[PDB]
Amino acid sequence: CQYKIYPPLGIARVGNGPAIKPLSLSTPEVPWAHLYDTNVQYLVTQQELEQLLEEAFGGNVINEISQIKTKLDERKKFKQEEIETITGLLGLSHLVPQQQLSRSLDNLEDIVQQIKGALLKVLSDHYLHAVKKQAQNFYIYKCDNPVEKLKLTDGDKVTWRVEVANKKSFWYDYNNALDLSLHTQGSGNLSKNVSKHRLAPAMTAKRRNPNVITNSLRKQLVISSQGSVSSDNNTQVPLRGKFPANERHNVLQGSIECDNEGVLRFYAGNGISQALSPSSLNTDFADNSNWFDDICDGRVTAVVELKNGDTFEIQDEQSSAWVATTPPDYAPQIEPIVTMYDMVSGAALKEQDLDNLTTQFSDVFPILYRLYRMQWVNQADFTDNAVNTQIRELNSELGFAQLLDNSASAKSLREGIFNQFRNPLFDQDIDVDDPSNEWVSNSRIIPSKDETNIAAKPATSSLKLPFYPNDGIDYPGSPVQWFAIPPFMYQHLQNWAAGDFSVTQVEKESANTIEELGLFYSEQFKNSPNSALLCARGALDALYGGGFCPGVELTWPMRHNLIYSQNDYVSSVTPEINLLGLREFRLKQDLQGLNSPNMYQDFGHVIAVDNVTASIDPNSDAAWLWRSTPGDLTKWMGIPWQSDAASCQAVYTPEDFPIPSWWAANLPVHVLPLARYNKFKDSQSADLPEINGMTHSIAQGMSEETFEHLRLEQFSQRLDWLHTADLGFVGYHAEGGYTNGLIQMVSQWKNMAMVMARPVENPGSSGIPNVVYVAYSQADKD
């Protein structure tokens, strides 16, 4: 146990920005590190393209064009040869096809400025406002238990190996999560009530692309690629497969590069999804035959070769890592209320032992903090969430620290909040038919789109929090139609309500507002010394942890301990501050990888919960389900992923409010557009010709009360995220609608609004906060 890779499951998100470090992003390696950073730039900016061009123009280059300099006046247009020496000296071939780099200057007529101006227009056309790629760094750590990053002495070398696959077009339809019927004692992620009382039965599912028959021909439906880089050369290596595999389209599944320090950087693909024929439209949220996308996932291994002749293979499952690519994160600073890291944390717990869990205030604070910040991506949490409004009331009197009071005098205050949260036992707010017993919710239901003109049964119980759909959505009247924080998080919240929690005094002293205490907790993360475990947590804390229909990035197999070969609590974040803890976890891996005999396994014409049941026994012919081969983590997800994203928005009920939202922290549903930001960010005293969209004369002529009221009216205008690009609703008599959204998202995903923290320098008495989160696209800019 000498060397280990971290994180154990890296994440990289597609984007159409380039796979170069200055113009890309990095998956968090420290939780909460950039929550309030108002300088973030998640879309490629004009300034970054300029600065990329300036760096590419450092002499040698100016002097040497001061020699084409002379040969053009010994001539008094360019010619091909000197065109091809101007590029490749600039080395922009890797960013834009050489062809239009060449025609770039072919059309031309300070000579250096007609070069830059012409090329920056080509770069701008390709990349301006592009969705930057979010890339994963992987690190070799020395062990015994990670102590520090491998440091390469001169003579040493680390070689990385990556093998990835996409099996979505090979795999089964996604009807709902198969574990909803799987027999269990209960985990911290999923209560045994769901299966025991048949609250959301697992559905059978047929094969995608069912016209391709025989295992041998179905292998064509799997895209795969592999690559290697080492610390001796930093050249980037593409991971390109074919679809269908050996027509034929090239599929860039990702890009890898290693620096001279031995760190691996992994980029995901460009977000390109396509059908084999133009007329095959992706009209289903999940299962569209004839389609491929560039999502992928697979096996990360390494070999450490010392100057001493000693070689260390990092290849076994306890030491190696995994990588998965996913849709973009359109609000990276907005955390899902329950994350994939929370799924790992709860998968090792037994439901009936949750009464042995001990709770710190920092264990419940994440729920309240995330729910509060959902206001930037979801209307119901801005104007229809009585917990968020109460947090606001506490902040207004510097009274948030009372939530940290574990004594009886604060008990009613704590219970009042806890009592609004949905219980993941799924046994409240129900009436039992036939006490053959069905559990029928007596709160608000989410109807099927297949309507019956018979008056609904009036709800008698209030809708609990949060207001999001969940795994049981397909079943009107199931309590599992709606999302609950999972058993172990609900148990923390319960212990908090009861008073059975601990908190330190230094915490109470930074808890006058939620923001103040969030900054404190963020500092605790940044000063934690276990960078390996923090980095493993940071890779998963941005991902969704329910509901799974199928979800955004990953889905339900992740919430079972069976998928991990190791999953151990290690320590608190701080000695005295748990903050949900740090764990050491690793996925189960097939050590043959792409050459595994189980690479092309399936269950015949359908998969069913019976197959999952059989897979529990590690001796069975079905246990391969849990021993991942490249492509196994993402094959469950929707194909192409853009159809899932377009159907990951609101689910309207007959009652107008609150509007349920699926996965709004990563796929926002209601956002604050750039256009509104430009109408509230200035104070009346700004000395510009336009002030918050008004002439100087009008803005300053109005009373100060009226000026501030107009600021807050603008701040309050939230736009449907689906309207931030043309998804089929633009134009006279445009049809609009659900299905056009899915169809158009294939090309428009890269134009949807991206939410970014921005400053409000002088909010005065307007009530607008100093940090706002603003949605940037091209339609919503003004």
Residue ranges of the binding site? 329, 331, 334, 665-666
The residue behind tokens 């929370």 is 342
Q: Angle between the 411-418 and 487-498 helix axes, to the nearest 10 degrees? A: 160
Taking the C-alpha atoms of residue 322 and residue 588, their distance in angstroms, rounded to an integer, is 10
Taking the C-alpha atoms of residue 436 and residue 681, their distance in angstroms, rounded to an integer, is 60
**Coil, helix or strand at residue 359:** strand
Q: Is the dihedral of CA 718, 326, 475, 336 positive or negative?
A: negative
Q: Residue 199 has which token pair?
A: 């609250």
Among 86, 256, 268, 334, binds Mg ion (CB under 5 A): 334
Residue 54 vs 655, nearer CB to its own copies: 655
Residues 648-677 that bind its own copies (CB under 8 A): 651-657, 673, 675-676
- Residue 276: contacted member of Mg ion, its own copies, none (CB under 5 to 8 Å, by partner type): its own copies
Residue 503 near its own copies by CB under 8 A: no
- Per the CB < 8 A criterion, the answer to whether 424 and 484 are in contact is yes
> Annotated binding site for Mg(2+), which residues?
329, 331, 334, 665-666
**Coil, helix or strand at residue 644:** helix
Instruction: Identify the helix (H) or strand (E) that includes residue 367.
Output: helix 361-373
Residue 14 near Mg ion by CB under 5 A: no
Q: Total residues contacting Mg ion (rule CB under 5 A)?
A: 5
Among 743, 752, 760, 772, binds its own copies (CB under 8 A): 743
Residues 696-715 that bind its own copies (CB under 8 A): 698-699, 701-703, 705-706, 709-710, 712-715
Residue 665 near Mg ion by CB under 5 A: yes
Residue 534 vs 665, nearer CB to Mg ion: 665
Residue 569 vs 738, nearer CB to its own copies: 738
Q: Angle between the 487-498 and 361-373 helix axes, to the nearest 10 degrees? A: 110
Residue 35 near Mg ion by CB under 5 A: no
Residue 298 near its own copies by CB under 8 A: yes
Determine how many CB atoms are found less than 10 A away from the CB of residue 403: 23
Considering the complex, what minimum distance in angstroms separates the CB of residue 415 from its own copies? Answer: 13
Residue 611 vs 666, nearer CB to Mg ion: 666
Strand partners, 233: 230
Q: Total residues contacting its own copies (rule CB under 8 A)?
A: 179
Residue 584 near its own copies by CB under 8 A: no
Among 329, 429, 541, 644, binds its own copies (CB under 8 A): 644
Which listed range, 128-136, 246-254, 328-336, 614-622, lies at the site for Mg ion (CB under 5 A)? 328-336
Considering the complex, what minimum distance in angstroms separates the CB of residue 722 from Mg ion? Answer: 17
Q: In 469-498, which positions are buried (b, 16+ CB within 10 angstroms) versus exposed (e)? A: bbbbbbbbbbbbbbbbbbbbbbbbbbbbbe
Taking the C-alpha atoms of residue 639 and residue 645, their distance in angstroms, rounded to an integer, is 10
Among 47, 63, 81, 732, binds its own copies (CB under 8 A): 732
Residue 161 vs 670, nearer CB to Mg ion: 670
Among 49, 194, 252, 331, binds Mg ion (CB under 5 A): 331
Which listed range, 85-93, 295-303, 654-662, 665-673, lies at the site for Mg ion (CB under 5 A)? 665-673
The residue behind tokens 């058993």 is 487
- Per the CB < 8 A criterion, the answer to whether 728 and 748 are in contact is no
- Per the CB < 8 A criterion, the answer to whether 692 and 680 are in contact is yes
Considering the complex, what minimum distance in angstroms separates the CB of residue 336 from its own copies? Answer: 21
Q: Angle between the 514-526 and 361-373 helix axes, to the nearest 10 degrees? A: 120
Residue 619 near its own copies by CB under 8 A: no
Residue 324 vs 725, nearer CB to its own copies: 725
Q: Residue 606 has which token pair?
A: 């359908």
Residue 282 near Mg ion by CB under 5 A: no
Residues 435-494 that bind its own copies (CB under 8 A): 436, 438, 440-441, 445-454, 456-457, 469, 473-478
**String of DSSP letters for 274-311:** EESSTT----SSSB-TTEE----EEEEEEEEE-TTS-E
Taking the C-alpha atoms of residue 82 and residue 439, their distance in angstroms, rounded to an integer, is 77
Residues 205-224 that bind its own copies (CB under 8 A): 205-220, 222, 224
Residue 113 vs 277, nearer CB to its own copies: 277
Considering the complex, what minimum distance in angstroms separates the CB of residue 332 from Mg ion? Answer: 6
Considering the complex, what minimum distance in angstroms separates the CB of residue 777 from Mg ion? Answer: 16
Which listed range, 89-97, 189-197, 325-333, 511-519, lies at the site for Mg ion (CB under 5 A)? 325-333
Considering the complex, what minimum distance in angstroms separates the CB of residue 191 from its own copies? Answer: 17
Q: Counting Cβ atoms within 10 Å, is residue 604 exposed (0-12), middle (13-18) or buried (19+)? A: exposed
Number of residues written out for the chain: 782
**Which residues here bind Mg ion, judged by CB under 5 A?**
329, 331, 334, 665-666
